[PDB]
């Protein structure tokens, strides 16, 4: 059930993004692409490492839920890229914000694919 996982993930992703917009001031635009949405099915193995890498920097409880959902959509033990999180504070916030933005966009895109 691809549709079921999208609907499971969507409120988690919306909340994470909107809470970041409300709490964090002055986050610069990174202009980077981090998440690859699709492989074609939703690309858990491309998205998962990023969520694993920001887990200590974010809400561990929601991230855990996201990871549990996305693991179900890793149709193999495909390999996971090792992610370099920026050390600089502003780069690091832009990195997190870009992940949340692109995750939001991916799910909304795949949801339009499904309707």
């Amino acid at each position, epitope marked *: 059930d691809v549709r079921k996982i999208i609907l499971e993930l969507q409120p988690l992703s*919306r909340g994470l*993004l*909107e809470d*970041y*917009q*409300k*709490k*964090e*001031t*002055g*986050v*610069p*635009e990174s202009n980077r692409t981090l998440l690859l949405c699709l492989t074609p099915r939703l690309n858990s193995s491309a998205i998962l490492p990023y969520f694993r890498a920001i887990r200590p920097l974010s809400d561990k409880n929601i991230i855990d839920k996201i990871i549990e959902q996305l693991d179900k959509l890793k149709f193999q033990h495909e390999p996971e890229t090792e992610i370099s999180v920026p050390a600089d504070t*502003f780069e690091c916030k*832009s990195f997190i*914000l870009t992940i949340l*933005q*692109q995750f*939001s*966009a991916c799910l*909304e895109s795949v949801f339009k694919s499904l309707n």
Partner: antibody, heavy 119, light 107 residues
Framework: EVQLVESGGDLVKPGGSLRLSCVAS????????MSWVRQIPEKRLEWVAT????????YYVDAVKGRFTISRDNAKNTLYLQMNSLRAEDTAIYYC????????????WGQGTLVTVSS | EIVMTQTHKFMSTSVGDRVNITCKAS??????LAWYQQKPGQAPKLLIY???NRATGVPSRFSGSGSGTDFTFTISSLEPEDVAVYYC????????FGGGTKLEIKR
């Protein structure tokens, strides 16, 4: 290319209402905070209102609170400003702008739509 | 509310000269300051953010400095296309703008 296009500006009497629209293209609209900024004839800039990606959080400048309402329709890539109880000093060019978080700077601006309130 | 004060509404300069535009905040904003340039009939354009980061494509003659409450926008060598109005803006807290400084050419 990122594009913001405002519409709805017009001539109104004090106490009237007006609804502004801003249609965005070139980015995933729901990924970004959006805001209105206005510029009065004397060319001072004043931030007006701000809305988070899915509408859960909004901020208003005091001068417009309880008269203006910011909202968005992500399906149509559209930002709105509902303006009630208009006054002469609301006369300004209204710009819609894109931001990363709710408190930030304004890297992208539309061309603006002129609102004139006069008896 | 954080008040941003640009002391000079207008400044005269000459092409080729250094220009120093000042902005002072009523409270500490750290480095959370942005500078915009505006030409007639156009929306303001972002030049500097986080007090000194030049936005993409902005010419190198423009720069910003300061942290805390006192900020400086500098054009190292004024060029004719630089005649415009410059505004500061803080984003430590709810957005406020300085009142603008209009550059005009001395003769």
């Amino acid at each position: 290319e990122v594009q913001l296009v405002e519409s709805g500006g017009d001539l109104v009497k004090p106490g009237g209402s007006l609804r502004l629209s801003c249609v965005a293209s070139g980015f995933t609209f729901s990924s970004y905070v959006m805001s209105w900024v206005r510029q009065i004839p004397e060319k001072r800039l004043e931030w007006v209102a701000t809305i988070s990606s899915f509408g859960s959080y909004t901020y208003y400048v005091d001068a417009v609170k309880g008269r203006f309402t910011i909202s968005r329709d992500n399906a149509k890539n559209t930002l709105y400003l509902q303006m009630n109880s208009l006054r002469a000093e609301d006369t300004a060019i209204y710009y819609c702008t894109r931001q990363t978080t709710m408190i930030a700077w304004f890297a992208y601006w539309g061309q603006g739509t002129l609102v004139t309130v006069s008896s | 509310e954080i008040v941003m004060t640009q002391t000079h509404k207008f400044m005269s300069t000459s092409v080729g000269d250094r220009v120093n535009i000042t902005c002072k905040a009523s409270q500490d904003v750290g480095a959370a300051l942005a500078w915009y340039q505006q030409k007639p009939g156009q929306a303001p354009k972002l030049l500097i953010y986080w007090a000194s980061n030049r936005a993409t494509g902005v010419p190198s003659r423009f720069s910003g400095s300061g942290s805390g409450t006192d900020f400086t926008f500098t054009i190292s060598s004024l060029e004719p296309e630089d005649v415009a109005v410059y505004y500061c803006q803080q984003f430590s807290s709810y957005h406020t703008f300085g009142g603008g400084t209009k550059l005009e050419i001395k003769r």
